[PDB]
Amino acid sequence: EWQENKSWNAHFTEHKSQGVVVLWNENKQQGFTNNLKRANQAFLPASTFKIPNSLIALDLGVVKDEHQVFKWDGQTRDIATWNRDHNLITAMKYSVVPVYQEFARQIGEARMSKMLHAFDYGNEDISGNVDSFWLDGGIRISATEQISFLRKLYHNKLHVSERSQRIVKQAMLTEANGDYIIRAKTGYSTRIEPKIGWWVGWVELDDNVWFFAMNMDMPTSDGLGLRQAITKEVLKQEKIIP
């Protein structure tokens, strides 16, 4: 069921880094990783949490649909793309923390805790501030746990409406061409050691789906592009994408 290929470590060490990639072949129900231990170690989800947060906001009516405009609050932040109006699509695309912090405040502690337990999401622990627990609170999730959550979303098996799940999968759209479609979300965790980057999602092919979840050490923001680059290089090596 699970296979470890330690040779894949070269994808990380050749960039003076360390990390884990986890792949899941949906047709064959088989998983692959370079590091079984790190595949099950739990980290802050950071902006990968925008996936469950979006689902909860939509199902509760906090967000009406993917067109609703969340007006910039007029507070100049250091990320230029955050200083503007957003909808769910652009908020996901630009990982707009302040929009999602307001979602969480409107969701509230009780409903957020209950929905994460319903999702079986990570350690399901929202200890900390309701508007930042996924950045510096107690919640944790492993790469293998990301896969389990994403598989439910893919199959519309999470305990929210089909509509909510369809909308979030639309907002996760990252890349599409004649060969494959990638739906995914990046993450960047800096408030608690070790600093890491995430990329989680799946690759849709004509006749199969491959789920993936990776994290890697990220001491500096200069390496953020490696999250996607390394993942796609692993996918190419395994002949999942050309």
Ligand SMILES: Cc1ccccc1-c1cccc(C(=O)O)c1
């Ligand atoms: C939080 C943050 C701090 C320092 C540098 C970049 C970022 C950031 C901000 C928004 C999106 C992303 C990203 O990866 O997509 C990264």
